[PDB]
Design a protein around this nucleic acid. Sequence first.
DNA 1: TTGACTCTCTTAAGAGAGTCA
DNA 2: TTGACTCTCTTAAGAGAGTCA
Lengths: 162, 162
Amino acid sequence: ALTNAQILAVIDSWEETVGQFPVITHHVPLGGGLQGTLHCYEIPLAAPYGVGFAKNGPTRWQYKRTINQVVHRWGSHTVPFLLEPDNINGKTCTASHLCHNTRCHNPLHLCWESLDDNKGRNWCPGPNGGCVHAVVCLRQGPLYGPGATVAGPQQRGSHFVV
Amino acid sequence: ALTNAQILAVIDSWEETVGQFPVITHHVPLGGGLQGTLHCYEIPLAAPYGVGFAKNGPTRWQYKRTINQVVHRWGSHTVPFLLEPDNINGKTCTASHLCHNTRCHNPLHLCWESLDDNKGRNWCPGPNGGCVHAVVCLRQGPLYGPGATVAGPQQRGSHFVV
DNA sequence: TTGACTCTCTTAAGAGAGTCA
DNA sequence: TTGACTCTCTTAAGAGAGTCA
Ligand code: NA
Ligand code: NA
Ligand SMILES: [Zn+2]
Ligand SMILES: [Zn+2]
Ligand SMILES: [Zn+2]
Ligand SMILES: [Zn+2]
């Protein structure tokens, strides 16, 4: 198995490569009607992506390194967290985009949490709109708002009470 | 079936049957430290479920009626909304449990909205904690809270900015 | 050892349809 | 006609692994 020193070297090589990804400035809602700026380090749309990187799905990538003749491969956003626990409360930890930008690999835009916690950030009001996440959101979730409900609760007769 | 009269008759028979489901009182967080009470009309755990109802998955059911000598069948929570548009902004409309209780078939606890709006209610602070849903939530979402994030955003070197 | 492709799987909110009796 | 089972699919946040040169 890899030593913790070998893992750190993988993280370091990953950071050096992602650091050369195009850095894109995005203006984003923070909640409370305020706007902020995030700087995303975006993997390219098509090959080549960068040393060690390959696309396994439309918006999925993996990072691969060969150490002492053994090929090791990780989800491309999981590498910052290789020295962290991989589960919590019986749930698998997942890479969670605080910037909600899947191509971004900026580790300052990622956290490591259950898939439920991950998903829920899509609807968060944001760091200036009432976010209660202990690891605070960087922006208002893209799906926050009143929604677009087509039909509300209703009955034709009188069989029901709320 | 095809005619509006036939659809109204389906809705009316569905309501009469669901109206005979056991009524279970559930005390629920509303947000803001307040508590409320909902009356869920719960489909039984095992057969028989009620006239027209059958279980197609651990927590999935369907409602079936014979009209024009043919069998018509729907997801068991979709029946209240058979006269509504079945899509919005090009997204499929789905039955959304405001009570977050899958066995409940109380139409006063259901709305009809995109799967994204549906999911997002799991994290809503609730009607007394800041819900902004235009069709208002009945309770705080079961997954609302600080989360259990294992690791936050971090870098080893100096390649990244937020 | 490396790049650029290929394939299927997980989760938890939701669906459609077939086989029998 | 009605009941009680069986199966796979959709979505959008996420994953693991094989083949070839
Ligand atoms: Na996410
Ligand atoms: Na729901
Ligand atoms: Zn980013
Ligand atoms: Zn948040
Ligand atoms: Zn209910
Ligand atoms: Zn709400």
